[PDB]
């Protein structure tokens, strides 16, 4: 009982203190953000 | 209303809406990160 409850408390502390454990999901937002921005910025290019 | 707006710098489509944004007295046109004009100052009067 003290092993599981303290372990869940470690998950709450590791998730609150470290925000980079979810970076796997933040990469998805970054890949979409770079893709949406690149497509619209090419409209200003002269394309020859 | 959605109308064609040209003040000296561009010809495009959009809706003019008053907001609380503040621009420098020496600034005229502005754009977002997508390189599209979201604001134009009135040539004759002072408006944003």
């Amino acid at each position: 009982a003290n092993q599981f409850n303290s372990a869940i408390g470690k998950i709450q502390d590791s998730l609150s203190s470290t925000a980079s454990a979810l970076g796997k999901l933040q990469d998805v937002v970054n890949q979409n953000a770079q893709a949406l921005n690149t497509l619209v910025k090419q409209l200003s290019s002269n394309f020859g | 209303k959605c109308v064609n707006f040209n003040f000296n710098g561009l010809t495009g489509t959009g809706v003019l809406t008053e907001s609380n944004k503040k621009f420098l007295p020496f600034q005229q046109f502005g754009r977002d990160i997508a390189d599209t004009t979201d604001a134009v100052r009135d040539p004759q009067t002072l408006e944003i």
């Binding site: 933040q26 949406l36 409209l43 | 977002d32």
Partner: peptide
């Protein structure tokens, strides 16, 4: 972590998800 409306001005439409955050939590 708007950027959605900024893309919609150039003709890029962001579609809303099928499952809302409330339904996903009800799945969990």
């Amino acid at each position: 972590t708007d950027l959605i409306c900024a893309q919609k001005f150039n003709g890029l439409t962001v579609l809303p998800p099928l499952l809302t955050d409330e339904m996903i939590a009800q799945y969990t």
